[PDB]
Write a protein that holds these residues in place. Structure first.
Motif, mmCIF file in Angstrom:
data_model
loop_
_atom_site.group_PDB
_atom_site.id
_atom_site.type_symbol
_atom_site.label_atom_id
_atom_site.label_comp_id
_atom_site.label_asym_id
_atom_site.label_seq_id
_atom_site.Cartn_x
_atom_site.Cartn_y
_atom_site.Cartn_z
ATOM 1 N N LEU A 103 0.824 -1.204 0.000
ATOM 2 C CA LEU A 103 0.000 0.000 0.000
ATOM 3 C C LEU A 103 0.862 1.259 0.000
ATOM 4 N N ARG A 104 0.641 2.113 -0.997
ATOM 5 C CA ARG A 104 1.295 3.413 -1.092
ATOM 6 C C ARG A 104 0.295 4.564 -1.052
ATOM 7 N N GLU A 105 -0.892 4.343 -0.486
ATOM 8 C CA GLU A 105 -1.997 5.289 -0.569
ATOM 9 C C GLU A 105 -2.208 6.084 0.713
ATOM 10 N N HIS A 106 -2.288 5.411 1.863
ATOM 11 C CA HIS A 106 -2.512 6.117 3.121
ATOM 12 C C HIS A 106 -1.282 6.884 3.584
ATOM 13 N N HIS A 107 -0.103 6.568 3.046
ATOM 14 C CA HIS A 107 1.062 7.413 3.284
ATOM 15 C C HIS A 107 0.910 8.755 2.579
ATOM 16 N N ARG A 108 0.229 8.769 1.433
ATOM 17 C CA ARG A 108 -0.128 10.013 0.766
ATOM 18 C C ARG A 108 -1.353 10.675 1.380
ATOM 19 N N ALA A 109 -2.075 9.980 2.261
ATOM 20 C CA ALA A 109 -3.198 10.607 2.946
ATOM 21 C C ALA A 109 -2.727 11.548 4.045
ATOM 22 N N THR A 110 -1.495 11.372 4.521
ATOM 23 C CA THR A 110 -0.989 12.200 5.609
ATOM 24 C C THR A 110 -0.245 13.431 5.107
ATOM 25 N N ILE A 111 0.340 13.368 3.908
ATOM 26 C CA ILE A 111 1.174 14.465 3.426
ATOM 27 C C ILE A 111 0.358 15.689 3.024
ATOM 28 N N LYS A 112 -0.922 15.507 2.690
ATOM 29 C CA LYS A 112 -1.792 16.638 2.400
ATOM 30 C C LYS A 112 -2.072 17.468 3.642
#
Ligand SMILES: CCCCC/C=C/C/C=C/C/C=C\C/C=C\CCCC(=O)O[C@H](COC(=O)CCCCCCCCCCCCCCCCC)COP(=O)(O)O[C@@H]1[C@H](O)[C@H](O)[C@@H](OP(=O)(O)O)[C@H](OP(=O)(O)O)[C@H]1O
Ligand SMILES: CCCCC/C=C/C/C=C/C/C=C\C/C=C\CCCC(=O)O[C@H](COC(=O)CCCCCCCCCCCCCCCCC)COP(=O)(O)O[C@@H]1[C@H](O)[C@H](O)[C@@H](OP(=O)(O)O)[C@H](OP(=O)(O)O)[C@H]1O
Ligand SMILES: [Ca+2]
Ligand SMILES: [Ca+2]
Lengths: 40, 331, 144, 331, 40
Positions: free
Chosen positions: D279-288
């Motif tokens: 999964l590489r998705e919820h790591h991008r959920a935090t950077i926003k």
């Protein structure tokens, strides 16, 4: 000889009392004393 | 509170034409009581300072001993301190720490001399000049102009004191053993040659000590020019700095005048538009007169809040620039 | 706006690793460090000093929602970014070359990666010349 | 390198609250060791300067003899010079040429006096005042203000020295043979009349030499006014020049603050637009969250980089001009 | 007569040490020492 030597202490304290008597008149004739109300 | 809030405006930060008569004809009592206190050391006019001067001093400390308590009791009209425990930080104000020292120390000296004694009255009678100049409005100017100009003052005092420490040592080496025209030796120690350095670096030139050997006169010439410049520097520095801070108070003092006259126009123009809805009819027939009446007074006050500027010819860089944008803006 | 005001609160309290209504500024220094930032405590206390307009440090989104409810694309924050080019402008016109923009991009402030700064000026230099104009960039930042 | 790069910040160009305690309580050791070295020439306080002062001087040169070698060994953390052959141009820095002269010459004088001897310690103990003021930040100010104002200084020194050379010759012609009130002749030679010229052109007025003939007093009057002005000129000149250079450093020192806060906004706004693809998705959920979080901190820093200006009321020529273009620009 | 003549050398070196003690505090409390990084 200190013949008229009262005249010097009469003169210099007079020219100090003049320069004080325009510093107390300069705050008596001031307009307001609000400390922090300028930039608001 | 109205029995106490008016006294705080009558003693501290005072205003009104009778506050000048109070706070100046107290100062013109301190001044006469100092002139008569210091015309006693002339050894020929000493007969004038009789014991009635001493009782005029004890009634003076009687007056100040209740003046301080009046200004202490009338201090609770302030948001900075209230009550009795808060009022101790009112007595952190250094004009009040000076005043307390004055009244209590002069009272203590008058008690022991009534049961070198009269000499202590002279210092604690000179000190009462400082405590009637209220608000500290003079030292706040100087303590900020020196702080703004700390770099140049520290620089030129360091260079001038280095030239004084250095070149008033070469004179002592050139004049360690040489006598005057009257049989004494001037530059006996280093401290004599340094007294000379301070005296000749500030251009006093008393004339008690002049270097006699022709080596020392050359060093005195060099150090004279090249340090008289660096010690005459702070006069010009603080002369610019004092005339630039009062012009920085006559900007914000005019900007404090502009804001309530730029409020009295908008708050009245909204009132002039609100003619629709604030027998209930003829009462509204009269308000249309007054909302147009006072609006013109506010309009005159706003144009009197910006057109008198202050040094009032400061539009001499932007003469046509205030109009050359607006006529472009109308096209 | 009705479809985002619910699932955003799942990410709002996601830093505290619990269900409390807390922005968790003390735990943000562990959450961002787990993400790979690891800042100092001085910059960490500076985050909620202006992010949270309440003043506590952990909030049930009075300003954590208002941080989301500040699009940073209207004319109130579009001239302040346009002033940041004007500090770098020489001889007017927004002259900024690709070499000068790469010089200022990889050196000052909070630096980008080379894979980011190498392609940052790509869409702002579509003509290929030595002038990355600010108006071509804030038009790309118009949806930011 | 970290065992040596920190010492170069601890000795030269120093910073931090303990560097003041190091570099000031060395200066407050030089000062006491100078006061006790120069209270020995008073001939009555000379008993205080015993041999323990001499051994406190030899431990002082022991301290400086390793201080110079510490600052020499810690010099290789510089891009301007490296190694051992490069470090010779570090010893071209004239504060280090002064320091080397101080330590080696004081050591040489202490060696010969241990196997007019004590007199040489006074000069090489005065010289140690200069070497603890690091960075030369004071002389760089004066050597540039004099260079900016070279024209007016050369002009007024030429006019003043021409008036001194000319009109202190007419006094000697008017006073070549005339005796004092005490039987001596003041203006015996030209050098006596020129000592007088320098002394009266800088407004010292010692009083050893006053022209007695009534021709010479007129010339002294004329040359007094018309050259006291031209010798009091450089005080005002350098007084403007010192307060205009520190304001030209508080422009560029604020402009050095504005640039990294005008970088931290653009480099973060590009980061805030790059939300599409770093999964590489919820790591991008935090950077926003963080790219919107730190952007507001950068926004606060940029508005704190231009709104506090410095003398902060310098908008008094362009009050309405910064707004009268923008409101025109919005139309 | 040099009775209190220590006071002068006590005073002048004090007023020199004050004007030095604000020149070393003026560089200790300085912010950065980057020589050539200003116009880049
Ligand atoms: C030989 C030659 C000379 C020998 C030596 C002579 C020097 C003698 C005395 C110095 C005299 C005056 C300087 C200060 C005057 C003075 O009043 O200073 C104080 C503060 O002082 C300090 O905290 C600290 C001030 C320290 C000053 C240095 C001591 C002014 O405090 P402030 O400036 O903060 O407040 C002003 C105002 O000055 C008063 O404090 C107060 O109004 P008033 O009730 O009318 O006074 C208002 O409220 P705040 O004080 O809450 O703001 C404000 O409107
Ligand atoms: C009786 C009254 C008075 C009696 C006489 C007293 C005067 C005594 C001494 C004068 C003292 C100071 C003036 C110069 C101070 C000074 O440090 O001057 C040097 C250069 O000097 C020369 O090349 C040549 C400088 C010649 C100065 C004239 C001699 C400054 O060289 P610089 O200005 O080029 O460089 C600066 C900095 O000053 C240092 O050189 C260096 O940083 P630090 O390592 O922290 O010093 C940085 O690198 P660069 O030097 O590579 O640029 C730069 O940040
Ligand atoms: Ca929490
Ligand atoms: Ca909060």
């Amino acid at each position: 000889r200190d013949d008229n030597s009262y005249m010097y202490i009469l003169f210099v304290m007079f020219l100090f009392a003049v320069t004080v008597g325009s510093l107390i008149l300069g705050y008596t004739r001031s307009r307001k004393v609000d400390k922090r109300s300028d930039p608001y | 509170t109205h029995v106490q809030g008016r006294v705080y405006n009558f003693l501290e930060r005072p205003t009104g034409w009778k506050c000048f008569v109070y706070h100046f004809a107290v100062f013109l009592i301190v001044l006469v009581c100092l002139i008569f206190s210091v015309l006693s050391t002339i050894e020929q006019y000493a007969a004038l300072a009789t014991g009635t001067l001493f009782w005029m001093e004890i009634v003076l400390v009687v007056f100040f001993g209740t003046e301080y308590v009046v200004r202490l009791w009338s201090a609770g009209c302030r948001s900075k301190y209230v009550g009795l425990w808060g009022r101790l930080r009112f007595a952190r104000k250094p004009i009040s720490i000076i005043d307390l020292i004055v009244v209590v120390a002069s009272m203590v000296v008058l008690c022991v001399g009534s049961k070198s004694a009269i000499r202590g009255i002279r210092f604690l009678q000179i000190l009462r000049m400082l405590h009637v100049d209220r608000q500290g409005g003079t030292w706040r100017l100087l303590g900020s102009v020196v702080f703004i100009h700390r770099q140049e003052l520290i620089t030129t005092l360091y260079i001038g004191f280095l030239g004084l420490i250095f070149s008033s040592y070469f004179v002592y080496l050139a004049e360690k053993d040489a006598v005057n025209e009257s049989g004494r030796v001037e530059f006996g120690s280093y401290a004599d040659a340094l007294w000379w350095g301070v005296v000749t670096v500030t251009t006093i030139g008393y004339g008690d000590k002049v270097p006699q050997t022709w080596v020392g006169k050359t060093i005195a010439s060099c150090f004279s020019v090249f340090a008289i410049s660096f010690f005459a520097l702070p006069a010009g520095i603080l002369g610019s700095g004092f005339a630039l801070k009062v012009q920085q108070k006559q900007r914000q003092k005019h900007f404090n005048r502009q804001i309530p006259a730029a409020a009295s126009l908008i708050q009245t123009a909204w009132r002039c538009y609100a003619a629709e809805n604030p027998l209930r009819e003829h009462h509204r027939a009269t308000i249309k007169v007054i909302r147009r009446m006072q609006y013109f007074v506010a309009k005159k006050k706003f144009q009197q809040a910006r057109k008198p500027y202050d040094i009032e010819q400061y539009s001499q860089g932007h003469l046509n620039l205030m109009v050359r944008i607006k006529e472009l803006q109308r096209r | 706006t009705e479809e985002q005001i619910a699932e955003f609160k799942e990410a709002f309290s996601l830093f505290d690793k619990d269900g409390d209504g807390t922005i968790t500024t003390k735990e943000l220094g562990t959450v961002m460090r787990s993400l790979g930032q690891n800042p100092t405590e001085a910059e960490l206390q500076d985050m909620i000093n202006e992010v949270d307009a309440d003043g506590n440090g952990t909030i049930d989104f009075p300003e954590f929602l208002t941080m989301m409810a500040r699009k940073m694309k209207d004319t109130d924050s579009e001239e302040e970014i346009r002033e940041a080019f004007r500090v770098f402008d020489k001889d007017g016109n927004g002259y900024i070359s690709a070499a000068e923009l790469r010089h200022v991009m990889t050196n000052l402030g909070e630096k980008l990666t080379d894979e980011e700064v190498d392609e940052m000026i790509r869409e702002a230099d579509i003509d290929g010349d030595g002038q990355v104009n600010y108006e071509e960039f804030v038009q790309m930042m118009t949806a930011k």
